[PDB]
């Protein structure tokens, strides 16, 4: 298993305009970030302070928003994640940059994305 420990903590190391966060109630997250009326292209990069090895890519589709977090930079590969029904557990950053134009955004919708509208 995995989920066992964790109570109340806070960590957010930033020195620029980074759009990375830790434990953000994904359930309630879609209530806030799911107010944006943009296309399935407004994504964020935060995960959990509960999942030791947990990174999620958040989207902002034109109905809702999501959180893809299951596997981080491991020694068996790199960014190990996909979607509700995908298997792309490989590179991300480098791919995201270039493929930002036409990558694997959200499940079956506007795969194209850019940034999010929350902080800056």
């Amino acid at each position: 298993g995995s989920p066992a420990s964790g109570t109340s903590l806070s960590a957010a190391i930033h020195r620029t305009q980074l759009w990375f966060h830790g434990r953000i109630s994904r359930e309630e997250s879609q209530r806030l970030i799911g107010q944006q009326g943009l296309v399935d292209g407004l994504f964020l990069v935060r995960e959990s302070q509960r999942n030791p090895q947990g990174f999620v890519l958040s989207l902002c589709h034109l109905q809702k928003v999501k959180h893809y977090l299951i596997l981080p930079s491991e020694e068996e590969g790199r960014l190990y994640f996909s979607m509700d029904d995908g298997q792309t557990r490989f590179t991300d950053l480098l791919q995201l940059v270039e493929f930002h134009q036409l990558n694997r955004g959200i499940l079956p919708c506007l795969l194209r994305h850019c940034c999010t509208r929350v902080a800056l």
């Binding site: 959180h67 977090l69 994640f81």
Partner: peptide, 10 residues
């Protein structure tokens, strides 16, 4: 199953 997340409930 129980969680939510994606790729799997986590």
């Amino acid at each position: 199953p129980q969680p939510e997340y994606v790729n799997q409930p986590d």
